[PDB]
């Protein structure tokens, strides 16, 4: 072993940690696609219905 190899192990830890945090960011993106679309649909529906009743 060497300090460089032990730091390779430490950077494997950092790789897992960064993967976790970046998976949280990726989850934010998944929200911004799918739940973004879901609440878009909800609000579009309510607007269109409150206008269609009046029409």
């Amino acid at each position: 072993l060497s300090d460089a190899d032990v730091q390779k192990q430490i950077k494997h830890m950092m790789a897992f940690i960064e993967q976790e945090a970046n998976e949280k960011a990726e989850e934010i993106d998944a929200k911004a696609e799918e739940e973004f679309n879901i609440e878009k649909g909800r609000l579009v529906q309510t607007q269109r219905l409150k206008i269609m009743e009046y029409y």
Binding site: D3, V6, Q9, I10, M13, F16, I17, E20
Partner: protein
């Protein structure tokens, strides 16, 4: 109660991804502890894994690891013939305990 014996300066802060552990004991097992506290688990961090206390019969030593690698250290401590000595970050608890022991000491008087 390990309390003030624990070296508060050697622990990780904001431990959301890195966690430290304390399962080290007897003196007769420390012939290569200088390499052990660098290599006990797959990814042990070598220097903040510092010796907290030094008796004639035992050494008390912290170690650092990843969120999910702590169990490996827990088992490897048994493989190295140690016993659990965990501290679980009881600094404010130690301060309150200090106040209470002093309260009892003064209550006697």
């Amino acid at each position: 109660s390990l309390a003030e014996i624990v070296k508060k300066d050697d622990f990780v802060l904001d431990s959301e991804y890195l966690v430290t552990l304390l399962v080290v004991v007897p003196k007769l097992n420390h012939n290569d502890w200088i390499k052990q506290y660098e290599t006990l688990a797959e990814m042990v961090v070598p220097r903040s894994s510092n010796v907290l206390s030094e008796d004639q019969d035992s050494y008390l030593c912290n170690v650092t690891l990843f969120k999910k690698a702590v169990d490996d250290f827990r088992h490897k401590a048994r493989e190295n013939k140690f016993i659990v000595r965990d501290f679980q970050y009881n600094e404010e608890e130690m301060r309150a305990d200090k106040e209470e022991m002093n309260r009892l000491s003064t209550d006697k008087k």
